[PDB]
Design a binder for this molecule. Structure first.
Ligand SMILES: O=CNCc1cc(COc2ccc(CCNC(=O)CC[C@@H](NC(=O)CC[C@H](NC(=O)CC[C@@H](C(=O)O)[C@H](CCC(=O)O)C(=O)O)C(=O)O)C(=O)O)cc2)co1
Ligand SMILES: Nc1nc2c(c(=O)[nH]1)N[C@H]1C(S)=C(S)[C@@H](COP(=O)(O)OP(=O)(O)OC[C@H]3O[C@@H](n4cnc5c(=O)[nH]c(N)nc54)[C@H](O)[C@@H]3O)O[C@H]1N2
Ligand SMILES: Nc1nc2c(c(=O)[nH]1)N[C@H]1C(S)=C(S)[C@@H](COP(=O)(O)OP(=O)(O)OC[C@H]3O[C@@H](n4cnc5c(=O)[nH]c(N)nc54)[C@H](O)[C@@H]3O)O[C@H]1N2
Ligand code: SF4
Ligand code: SF4
Ligand code: SF4
Ligand SMILES: [K+]
Ligand SMILES: [K+]
Ligand SMILES: [K+]
Ligand SMILES: [Mg+2]
Ligand code: NA
Ligand SMILES: [S]
Ligand SMILES: [W+6]
Ligand SMILES: [Zn+2]
Ligand SMILES: [Zn+2]
Lengths: 569, 268, 80, 129, 429
């Protein structure tokens, strides 16, 4: 079909367009230079036009997500819906799959990544994707506690690890090398953990630092579109900021080498809010986001996302098994766990981030400090580690917070515990994000660092026709004073197109197409590959609980396979 | 003041009628009340389709007294989330009567089904007949349940009365089955009759008084002795009670079971 | 002589004997790890058509481990 | 005699249901009551004799069988199936799950015949529609 | 004869995927590695009725109809129904379960699986206190202590012990000799006969025994000198066995979901396993029955937010087990129609529910002759998942494995039957 999007204020940071009024032309799911005079018109007068949002880190599809759904029926009773055109759903903090896709779409997001897939459970993730409307998607298989990875990397055999990874990304139909609490989750298999990046796991005797370094080497040896995706050790502990900065340095001198896309960074650090803590106990707990932000400013090898607290009752779900048990120990709330043989672990705990409480107050401040003290938006992405710090439905409120120091001070001076002022510097920061910087952290940075900026994250010719129109007029409305108009406008887009077809109009979902599944296609020396596959099959016979032939994901689970090539021949 | 609903023949497929409460009836003519929506299975219908309606309107829910002059054993959720006024049922009700109640009073002159007063916040519920399971309980998965109000069952109740209670007061004048006060955090349960088993299973706080006989009890409770002349939550109880603290299967448990000495020597 | 004898009519097909057997374990890593053999192997007994089935009685060393593992006395060491 | 009725699985009843619940095999595997030999003696019955089981909720005729999995004193075992489900406790206590296990029943010898599978269902009196 | 390897067995929640099928012609005539039950499903037993065409009851007598006629009348019944029950699901594959969810949505029905008569109480329990589990491979390679609590795997999961206990694992290379095996059951079951410790406790008193164990675990004194028929001093000795584990696994089953307390028996069991993790790594796995009961609770959860007992009457999903459960609707006479698929409630519901099945239209998507077909008005035979039809199933601890199609069938698959049933139901509405 043909569409012309007329007279909108276009924000496209990758093509350097900053609020220029400009028409966008669309033809057969692509953005093109011109269309016929018979093209149907979408009036964007007095409205903002952006590329479809691109979420680089969310928990939306898989086993740990569905445990959060299944064991929180009270969360569904809180927010249950049936829009009569579409499928029923429920779940405030962990929504069902159909509800999930609808709501990304309603807020103008068209691509969202599942950030933690246990390889043995990969069929589950892909089955939930099929029932997730609209959004294009991908899944990050986990590597930081993998038995093959730990065995190969200790022997210094990085090529064999790269052959294993090549096999695993193809077998799970995965997209990035995700590292969560490296070595620590394997230590949790016996009820323990690792402390700092030089503390080895039981038996395997390899450090987090060596796991991070080896997998970064593997990542660029396989020329993957995205970098290693790192969830640090010592998450959520007072004083952990030093473990974080030490982790950030480990892969710095590894040079990026994507075969697809424009990524120029070797490290992606996720939900860094949780890794920016000072003090030594919760009683002297203090923000260290300035030192963290200062590291990012001075370094050119790192991209981060924040993991912003939204001050809600939400659900936490992570592959960081030992950390969730500690969290259950503190708040006493229901606790789920799943250790996956030879591969990973996981935990699920509800958490109430009450604005009244001192610790969540400081946690909210830390994320704001990270957003506002980092100078270059090209180094940061907007995330809530959904749902860990809050549901993704609250990205507009995060946007509103960043665009308005009025909104922030209203919350700081009333409702937020005093500790937000005493134990951080948020109150002294009056910086406000512009509409251009918002599009950068919600579209461009993520699209670029994921290796998709050829087709995603921009409104230029050649891009996919993933487009969001927000009913807000930047010439006429003041984002600082009218922060509730910013929040409401980014929640319910006036028009959303997904591959050239209208899928949302005035906040209403009007179509339910299936999105593509991006995965990574890599080729490795056939000789090393065979040897590794012989070794892999031997342990399956001995130590796995399934048969090797039944393990990889069959093609029936990817109706819309969209391979992306890394290293070839 | 008085609005009369006379039930027609009740259907085998039950009705759900949350909108039968003073808050909705307020400010409505008799004709508008007949047109209130209720559910009949998977069909939306009108209250008039199953009830004759007479009486005089009123503008404020405080002044409205709904009396259901007939058996409504197959209607659920009557008085759900009512804040003020009064409901009288001259017969039996189904599940969820007064669920989510914030204020006012409901009197059921016959039996009530399960989840009577579920998630109660305030007000009063009185059931002259028997009640089902989960009197004053929480909802599935939630650890925060009933926080206020008073429920009085003159007959017997069944299982898990006061599940996850966190405030309020339940009084069972008859007998209960098993697990009264399961997962209790706060509040008061008084069982004037007997208990089959597991009174206070996994309670963390609150108070359970049993004036009859507990056939079985639980090894996670520490016996503290006998207390006389007990004052709890504004109610004075005469006689002596064996005093237990638990359930110490739970960390930091401070709950209290009082069991009357006359019929509970085997529990000590 | 004392030898291996199967009572398939009492057998559950549960596989404890097949996995417990050290001759089976040494010869098939899948059996050692608790799986039924999928690759072709010559071992003493397997579960076939739902019941225990002796294939190579000459390899049996009459140690008694399988018998200990069978709760329903479906595999035995007795005369002939 | 007052006894405690317990119900559940047996491989023979598992084999039977996947062979066919219309088969004679299924009556033999599921229309039985397992008893300790000492209880059979006290009741004056032998293996193959029939037993009438009566509870608050129903009644059924089953074939007495010597338990090879020993039972606690006073307990009997009927495998899961429609015979066992004539007599166990239906109420779910607002959980949706009936009380299939550990139900007080009365057992007495009987010369009546065990009902086969389609005949047993006729007592519920299915009306067509 | 041809040998098809790596077949997944469609019976119990062990979901063994190393079955070899022997195929003669287009027929499966034998198996390797499958146990006595699994073998019985794969192979045809002589004299057993396998419906080859749909049937309808004309009062008294069944008459063969076409697929379109049977699905036709089935759609009428659900469209006209004001409280239809769509029950079963556990013995078909996930893609059919997904269609069923959409169809229950379209008909304003209550959809429910065998969890409501099975590990439902574990679902209620895990919703309240949590769910600390692991996969089979962590048990095989790490487990130091293995407990079977109120389950009899020798008869109900026959290969479960051989794969998880007798197996030689990475850190347990001596298999059975490296593990302390505990069984808790009022009977001396064949599973109990293999145990190192058998708690032969009093029936209906697990909740009391678990209350003593946890109080002991947290340092408190056990009030009475005997609990659930077990002497005080062994409660303490058993608590010491669990505390000294390097890796413990609690497998539990119907002896604890069906017993007095039901979901609260699971509740206290879960919380003990949780608290033990301050002394020793501990985890639990429910011994879920059918090969894909777990899959339905997965599919229904992710599509709707709730795992079972899901009622779409109001459009949005609502969830109240005890109100919205199959046996609740039947025994309270709420259901005015019921559709059965891949389940046999005629054989396996209590008397009180069957009496209601006698009064209402019952549709049965069923390949074999059962007590449910004897109570059925419409019978629609399908291709059998795992033998004649493929699809995803979920093992008892959540591991997804794709069921294989081994031989061909002229009959329609469940998924296709349900997609046609849904198309017509919309025509009606
Ligand atoms: N893959 C990513 C991922 C992320 C996640 C999710 O992870 C995380 C990680 C970490 C957590 C946070 C940990 N949880 C907690 O801290 C809970 C509370 C905790 N401690 C406190 O509240 C300390 C403060 C408290 N202070 C006061 O009460 C002072 C009173 C003031 C007054 O009167 O106003 C008083 C006023 C003084 C005056 O008058 O001026 C004062 O402040 O001194 C105290 O004294 O202990 C405890 O012990 O209960 C959450 C989630 C999952 O997966
Ligand atoms: N042969 C066969 N196998 C099957 C099935 C089948 O029908 N037949 N169905 C499958 C299904 S659906 C399921 S759910 C699983 C079920 O597998 P299991 O969980 O083993 O179910 P059951 O065999 O019914 O009961 C287990 C044990 O609980 C014991 N028990 C009874 N009362 C009590 C008590 O108060 N406390 C304790 N601790 N134990 C008690 C009984 O003695 C019984 O041995 O099996 C699956 N496999
Ligand atoms: N007294 C007592 N009663 C009980 C129990 C107990 O322990 N004691 N246990 C309870 C429990 S846990 C359960 S789960 C139930 C048993 O639950 P049920 O679901 O009744 O188990 P089955 O009787 O095996 O029924 C499965 C049916 O699915 C059919 N089938 C097989 N493959 C396919 C397929 O591909 N498609 C379709 N459509 N159908 C197929 C089979 O022919 C069979 O009729 O019994 C319950 N009732
Ligand atoms: S023999 Fe005893 S053990 Fe070996 S299988 Fe037949 S039953 Fe299981
Ligand atoms: S006897 Fe010793 S050897 Fe011969 S089989 Fe049984 S186990 Fe293997
Ligand atoms: S075990 Fe459960 S699954 Fe593995 S075979 Fe015997 S039955 Fe089929
Ligand atoms: K949910
Ligand atoms: K404040
Ligand atoms: K068969
Ligand atoms: Mg609850
Ligand atoms: Na990891
Ligand atoms: S099941
Ligand atoms: W079951
Ligand atoms: Zn993370
Ligand atoms: Zn995350």
């Amino acid at each position: 079909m043909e569409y012309i999007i007329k007279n909108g204020f276009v924000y496209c940071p990758l093509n350097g367009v900053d609020g220029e009024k400009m028409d966008i032309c669309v033809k057969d799911g692509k953005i093109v230079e011109s269309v016929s005079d018979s093209a149907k018109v979408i009036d964007a007068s007095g409205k903002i036009v952006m590329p479809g949002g691109v979420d680089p880190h969310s928990h939306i599809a898989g086993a740990k997500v569905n445990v959060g759904r299944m064991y929180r029926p009270e969360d569904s009773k809180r927010d249950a819906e049936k829009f009569k055109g579409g499928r029923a759903g429920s779940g405030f903090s962990v929504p069902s799959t159909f509800m999930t896709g609808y709501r990304y779409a309603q807020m103008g997001y068209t691509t969202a990544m599942e950030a933690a897939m246990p390889p043995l459970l990969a069929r589950h993730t892909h089955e939930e994707f099929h029932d997730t409307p609209i959004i294009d998607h991908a899944a990050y298989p986990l590597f930081g506690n993998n038995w093959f990875v730990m065995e190969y990397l200790k022997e210094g055999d990085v090529d064999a690890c790269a052959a294993y990874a090549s096999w695993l990304l193809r077998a799970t139909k995965g997209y990035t090398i995700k590292i969560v609490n490296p070595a620590g989750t394997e230590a949790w298999g016996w009820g323990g953990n690792v402390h700092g990046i030089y503390d080895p796991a039981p038996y395997f005797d390899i450090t987090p630092a060596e796991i991070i370094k080896g997998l970064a080497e593997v990542n660029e040896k396989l020329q993957l579109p995205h970098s290693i995706h790192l969830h640090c050790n010592d998450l959520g502990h007072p004083g952990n900021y030093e473990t974080t900065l030490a982790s950030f340095d480990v892969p710095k001198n590894i040079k990026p080498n994507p075969a697809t896309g424009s990524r120029d960074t070797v490290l992606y650090a996720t939900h860094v809010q949780f890794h920016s803590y000072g003090g030594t106990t919760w009683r002297d707990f203090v923000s260290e986001a300035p030192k963290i932000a200062d590291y990012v400013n001075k370094n050119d090898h790192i991209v981060i996302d924040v993991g912003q607290i939204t001050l809600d009752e939400t659900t936490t779900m992570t592959a960081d098994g030992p950390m969730e048990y500690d969290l259950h120990s503190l708040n006493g709330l229901k606790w789920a766990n799943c250790d996956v043989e030879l591969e990973t672990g996981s935990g699920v705990v509800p958490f109430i981030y009450s604005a009244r409480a001192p610790v969540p107050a400081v946690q909210w401040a830390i994320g704001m400090e990270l957003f506002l003290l980092i100078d270059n938006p090209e180094k940061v992405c907007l995330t809530t580690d959904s749902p860990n710090a809050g549901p993704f439905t609250r990205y507009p409120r995060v946007i509103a917070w960043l665009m308005s120091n009025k909104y922030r001070m209203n919350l700081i001076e009333g409702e937020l515990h005093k500790w937000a002022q005493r134990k951080s510097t948020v109150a002294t920061i009056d910086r406000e994000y512009t509409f251009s910087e918002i599009a950068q952290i919600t579209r461009a940075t993520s699209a670029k660092v994921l290796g998709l900026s050829d087709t995603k994250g921009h409104l230029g010719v050649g891009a996919d026709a993933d487009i969001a129109v927000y009913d807000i007029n930047p010439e006429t409305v003041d984002p600082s004073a009218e922060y509730m108009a910013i929040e409401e406008a980014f929640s319910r887009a006036a028009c959303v197109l997904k591959d050239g077809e209208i899928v949302v109009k005035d906040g209403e979902v009007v179509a339910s197409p299936h999105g593509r599944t991006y995965w990574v296609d890599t080729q490795v020396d056939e000789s090393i590959y065979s040897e590794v596959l012989a070794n892999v099959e031997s342990k399956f016979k001995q130590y796995y609980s399934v048969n090797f032939a039944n393990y990889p994901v069959q093609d029936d689970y990817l109706p819309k396979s969209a391979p992306v090539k890394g290293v070839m021949l | 003041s008085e609005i009369i609903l006379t039930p027609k023949e009740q259907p085998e497929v039950p009705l759900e009628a949350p909108n039968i409460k003073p808050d909705v009836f307020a400010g409505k003519s008799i004709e508008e009340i007949k047109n209130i929506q209720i559910m009949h299975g998977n069909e939306v219908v009108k209250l008039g389709d199953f009830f004759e309606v007479s009486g005089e309107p009123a503008d404020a829910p405080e002044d409205i007294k709904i009396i259901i002059d007939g058996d409504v054993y197959n209607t659920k959720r009557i008085g759900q989330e009512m804040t003020a006024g009064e409901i009288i049922v001259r017969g039996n009700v189904n599940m969820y009567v007064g669920a989510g109640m914030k204020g006012g009073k409901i009197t059921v002159e016959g039996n009530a089904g399960s989840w009577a007063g579920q998630d109660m916040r305030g007000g009063e519920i009185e059931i002259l007949g028997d009640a089902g399971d989960y009197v004053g309980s929480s909802y599935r998965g939630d650890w925060r349940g009933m926080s206020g109000g008073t429920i009085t069952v003159h007959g017997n109740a069944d299982n898990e009365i006061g599940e996850y209670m966190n405030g309020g007061k339940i009084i069972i004048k008859g007998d209960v089955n098993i697990m009264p006060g399961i997962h209790m955090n706060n509040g008061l349960i008084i069982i004037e009759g007997n208990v089959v088993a597991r009174a206070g299973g996994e309670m963390a706080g609150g108070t359970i008084v049993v004036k009859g006989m507990m056939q079985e009890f639980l090894a996670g409770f520490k016996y503290l002795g006998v207390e006389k002349d007990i004052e709890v939550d504004g109610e004075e109880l005469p006689g002596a009670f064996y005093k237990f603290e638990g359930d110490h299967a739970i960390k930091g448990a401070k709950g209290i079971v009082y069991a009357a000495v006359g019929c509970n020597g085997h529990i000590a | 002589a004392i030898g291996l004898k199967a009572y398939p009519e009492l057998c559950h097909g549960c596989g404890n004997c097949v996995i417990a057997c050290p001759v089976n374990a040494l010869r098939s890593p899948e059996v050692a790890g608790g799986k039924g053999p999928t690759d072709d192997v010559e071992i003493i007994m397997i579960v076939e058509d739902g019941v225990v089935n002796i294939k190579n009685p000459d390899l049996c060393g009459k140690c008694g481990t399988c018998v200990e593992s069978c709760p329903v006395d479906a595999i035995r060491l007795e005369e002939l | 005699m007052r006894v405690i009725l317990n119900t559940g699985r047996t491989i023979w009843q598992g084999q039977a249901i996947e062979s066919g619940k219309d088969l004679k095999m299924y009556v033999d595997a599921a229309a039985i009551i397992q008893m300790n030999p000492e209880m059979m003696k006290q009741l004056g019955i032998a293996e193959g004799d029939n037993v009438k089981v009566i509870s608050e909720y129903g009644d059924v005729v089953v074939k007495a069988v010597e338990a090879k999995e020993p039972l606690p004193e006073g307990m009997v075992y009927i495998p899961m199936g429609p015979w066992a489900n004539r007599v166990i406790r239906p109420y779910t206590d607002s959980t949706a799950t009936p009380s299939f296990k550990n139900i007080p029943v009365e057992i007495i010898p009987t010369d009546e015949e065990v009902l086969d599978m389609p005949t047993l269902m006729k007592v519920y009196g299915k009306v067509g529609q | 004869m041809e040998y098809v390897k790596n077949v997944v067995c469609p019976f119990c929640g062990t979901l063994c995927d190393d079955i070899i099928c022997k195929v003669e012609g287009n027929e499966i005539v034998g198996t390797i590695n499958a146990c006595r039950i699994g073998h019985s499903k794969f192979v045809h037993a002589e004299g057993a009725m396998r419906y080859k065409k749909p049937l309808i009851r004309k009062n008294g007598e069944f008459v063969e109809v076409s697929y379109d006629e049977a699905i036709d009348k089935a759609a009428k019944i659900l469209a006209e129904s004001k409280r239809p029950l769509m029950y079963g699901w556990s013995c078909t594959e996930c893609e059919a379960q997904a269609v069923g969810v959409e169809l229950a949505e379209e008909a304003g029905a209550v959809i429910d699986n065998t969890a409501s008569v099975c590990h439902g109480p574990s679902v209620l329990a895990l919703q309240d206190v949590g769910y600390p589990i692991c996969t089979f491979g962590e048990v095989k390679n790490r487990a130091d202590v293995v407990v079977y609590w109120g389950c009899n795997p020798m008869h109900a999961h026959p290969r479960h012990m051989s794969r998880n206990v007798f197996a030689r694992g990475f850190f347990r290379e001596r298999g059975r000799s490296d593990r302390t095996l505990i069984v808790v059951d009022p009977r001396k079951t064949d599973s109990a006969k293999l145990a190192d410790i058998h708690l032969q406790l009093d029936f209906d008193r697990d909740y009391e025994l678990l209350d003593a164990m946890r109080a002991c675990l947290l340092g408190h004194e056990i009030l009475y000198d005997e609990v659930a028929g077990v002497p005080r001093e062994q409660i303490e000795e058993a608590v010491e066995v669990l505390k000294n584990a390097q890796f413990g696994i609690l497998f539990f089953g119907m002896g604890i979901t069906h017993s007095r307390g039901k979901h609260r028996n699971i509740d206290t069991a879960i919380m003990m396993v949780q608290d033990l993790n301050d002394y020793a790594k501990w985890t639990l796995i429910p011994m879920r029955g059918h090969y894909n009961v777990t899959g339905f609770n997965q599919v229904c959860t992710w599509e709707s937010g709730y795992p079972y007992c899901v009622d779409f009457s109001g459009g949005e999903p609502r969830y109240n087990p005890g109100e919205t459960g199959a046996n609740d609707l039947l025994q309270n006479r709420e259901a005015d129609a019921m559709m059965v698929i891949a389940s046999d409630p005629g054989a396996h519901f209590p008397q009180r529910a069957l009496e209601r099945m006698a009064e209402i239209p019952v549709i049965a998507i069923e390949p074999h002759r059962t007590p449910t077909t004897e109570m059925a008005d419409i019978i629609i035979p399908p291709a059998i998942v795992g033998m004649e039809a493929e699809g995803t199933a979920y093992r008892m601890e959540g591991v997804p494995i794709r069921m294989k199609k081994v031989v061909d069938s002229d009959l329609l698959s469940d998924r296709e039957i349900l997609e046609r049933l849904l198309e017509k139901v919309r025509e009606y509405k």
